[PDB]
């Protein structure tokens, strides 16, 4: 239903950075720099440019002061300068609004194309970026909870099949998804860079940004983030985890920034770069699909997500999902989940796992 | 009100083993050997004797086939052979029922005393044990989830101060506890060997055994146990965790065996050996006391625990706690907890966290 | 010196497997399966097919019984069936010997091309492969030392710039290298899959295969491999490490199989997938370039490597390196190394670091 | 031939702190605070008092500015105030020089006794100490290389059985030792607190202090210390390691402070608190006894150690070892070591393991 354009898709390398509008620049700086340990590439009174430990492009996160907290741009890096032209021609044919700046929208990025995509998300495509010192061996700066890479975005959208087809035509490959036996798709994960994903689609009212995810080297680094949050007595900002994912097989943690933007810390998924990488489909009632250890998913994780902006800086209107709700079918009043397929023992009726 | 005997206390070194009655020996073996990777010191059709990676005494766990799943004995090693005689005289003065077997109750233990202690728990005291190969450097046998030591027991009892004074007289020292402003004690941790505890008292209906705990080297070993349980599709047997404890500061996991005996896997508490080791008291309403990260404690963790047997092998009758319930005052309908004292942001009312 | 063909290079995805010839199959099986924990895809009296924990292709290593221990093939997977045709045309234009087998050289691989490449190495290109159970969440099988992926090969060749140009034309990008101030290149690392490398060139007499590398999830997994080797009283088979590499930033260990084939265990390098990824050049006299902690590199690491076979299965003749020797210029009698550039303190003259000399 | 006194031994709990004389207080501070991350309890122009992450007594390390770098005191905490009096009577009966200060020798310690012990070492015994904030849950301060406890001292002394007998009479129990088949003892480990050791005796010219050891929680913490030293371009101050010890089974690293005082970082030894804890004797030629992975012991580890002071602040005279040297019998020109006892394969004669000889 989103048609495949005749124009070639641009060659997208990876997710590269997010621009997030925040309301109190000092509080957010404290969260992202003081608590999480991200590295400042540039800052002034309006913006903070932050990067992970192993990054060499200018930034992975731009915090921009504004009146309404929201995603302003989710940016992917393309292979060549000519891929920014291809992106522009591709989104024109799709009838999408686009805006092209030879000198970039944020500091440290050159020629860039921003678009309101067919799902209502603000995508940016760019090649040119100002290189900075790669801190990958600066173990003199390395913190016990060090965030090493930007890994993915996760987007909330009402119709997952619709979005999936569009991203596949754009060159993303589905690695895992969640479905039921009645034809509904609840979520899908897709990649360009050869990890489990660069973005993911989560079925719900949208467009909204569910989260932005950063990686650590090891599982103990994620444990340390939790421990530090307890020491700072902000354990209430730990939403969910730590855990092992079923889908993706990664060790994880979800935390909430001062504007409630959700950040995931993630480590140790697997290689997906082969073009016939086997796709894995989970059943929506399988209680090990989201947390492998069967720990319950808190309802806020399903219902809460960040607003997104259009190209003019106004909030995108939210469209309701009419397909079945992952929350309702697993943990709501008429919900169901199993530990072992076909086994009544270890199954949950009308409530979440673990009592 | 448990009187201090004039007879000297036995010198207790550490918690050493538990004997657990199980209903299906083969299923239990599958859990303790095939899933958890404990090492077989002896087995036959009626019992399995198991030990941890770094142990040199005969065993840390005995699984005995019986009709009713229950704790049959929680055993402490004493410093000398004479300490068994001291234990006998001590418990006889307390008016407790005792039984002395010069050749032991279980294989690989020699002269031993079992008692029905004043809290109704079956304690064993012994010195003599058959030494076995210490597997501490057998990395050829080392599992990704390796259990390296027995760390502690945790006992459910209705009146914590009563039990705590009795254990102090036995030479245990309290390291941490949970209290409220009204003066109720909900739990206490106490030690002999210089870790946070060898046993602990949890307020509730008892005598019941809350859990037995084993230690791993590192946090990743606990993660692996969870991961393996997912792979075996037995994640419903993960009860609580993994987490960081507030009390003890240890990384932890609670799992349930086939008869619902609860096992804790535990690592990285701190040294308590100095006699003036500072005691830490947590408020019962502090949401970081049990899980430092503020994760909720599932009601089953407070309400479910194992039966204990008397010396004849019958189940000990339960006495109901009359002091306030930690479940009720934190997560029950009129309960509450906080992240930051005095702050309504991050506080939970009539409701658990997260 | 090696010309760029007019024919397009095949689109290479990644290193996929190696076929090693071994002299005693049962001894090699004990090393790779019982010691290292690799998973058996297939075996018989003549071959063992092994894979890592996260692999879905049929195998990452084939051990083949033969009279002379050697590398028989280093195989790269290509993106499409049509890329195998491209590889054939490309290598024919380079004037190399090639062999095409529609149903594969080894079990579990389909249409495959093997070539004697311009550096004398037996390369294989394939697309078609039998998928198997991907064991990535089989934590009921996971060992304390689990090998999760095949990561790279490392090749010994006498002229590194000559090979580097050829691999760049083939589509590999150099991520790191080691050079001196007098124009000599000692080593280069190059990738297709977006890690530090899929293969590497190490200057020395060749063609010889230096090692094959597998990855683990965490550093403690590499430690456990060492610990287990101690417990099995085969610590004499730990060649070098564990350590932190300067080049690649990975945590590492080198061990030796029963035929002296060198295996590296490797973890936690960085992403190189961007086309303008910064190339890092280390100076050969920098004592943190190979081991970041400054531990000395054992001389066998520089001198010993496995024979490689031609398409007929005969050993390839060795061509001697005439460029300067990394061993000689760093830890040899006229050698030099530094800890801090320009500082005499922490420098080493005619001997290795940490109080050692060449045996 | 150090007699057992009639007077009762003091009840020693554990090693508690060391007082090290250092020549440049600012440079030592950069090392212990900025590099290693210890926590400051008190400092001024003359001294810096440091503690580990889990400590509640005032300090584990006192750095005292002075003219000659040396160990000034190795302090053990005793169980009660009365035990300081027992210590005094005990050493007086041995005929040792003692000095008692009711208000301590350093800040944060109360009634204390220093003695010049029969091996020439300056020992302090105390009970009273100023309690400080226990930082064990201050994960807001926790570094990637955090030192969590003080674990042990290691002493160099010419006659190990003489020293061992004396420590046994003080209540220390031997856990492990190294010997040869002809009855020479090279080293012994002994404990009070239920870990492998609180102090250890290493055969050599002495009295000298070999090292002070701190523990970390996990192996990755020790790896981070190396990684950080590499980043700071002070890898030349990594003496030996990281490794796994044979004796003790601990993961370890040895580093050198600005005055060449050796610090060990140590983790994951085993419980020894039972009175019949099985002792383990290793053969001196076993190449897995010091490093379980067979990595060679750097010669400086055998030859270099810190001076110790007498109670007036003067350096103690050094007495030479007349028994065999561990260095000489294992890695010297006439030395040997084995991987498997009796097996020539994996054995080393006249040189160290892994292909190095002595520099
Ligand atoms: Ca030069
Ligand atoms: Cl999830
Ligand atoms: Cl708890
Ligand atoms: Cl290297
Ligand atoms: Cl050693
Ligand atoms: Fe995610
Ligand atoms: Fe416990
Ligand atoms: Fe390599
Ligand atoms: Fe030591």
GROMACS .gro file of C-alpha atoms and ligand atoms in nm, chain B residues 178 189 240 245-247 252 254 264 289-291 297 301-302, ligand 3:
model
   16
  533UNK     CA    1   1.517  -0.438   5.854
  544UNK     CA    2   2.123  -1.134   5.888
  595UNK     CA    3   1.273  -1.350   4.154
  600UNK     CA    4   2.036  -0.677   4.702
  601UNK     CA    5   2.023  -0.367   4.922
  602UNK     CA    6   2.085  -0.568   5.237
  607UNK     CA    7   2.128  -1.257   4.343
  609UNK     CA    8   1.600  -1.709   4.340
  619UNK     CA    9   1.936  -1.858   4.601
  644UNK     CA   10   1.635  -0.251   5.075
  645UNK     CA   11   1.562  -0.586   4.907
  646UNK     CA   12   1.624  -0.503   4.545
  652UNK     CA   13   0.936  -0.840   4.542
  656UNK     CA   14   0.876  -1.471   4.803
  657UNK     CA   15   0.715  -1.359   5.130
 1430LIG    CL1   16   1.595  -0.962   4.967
   0.00000   0.00000   0.00000
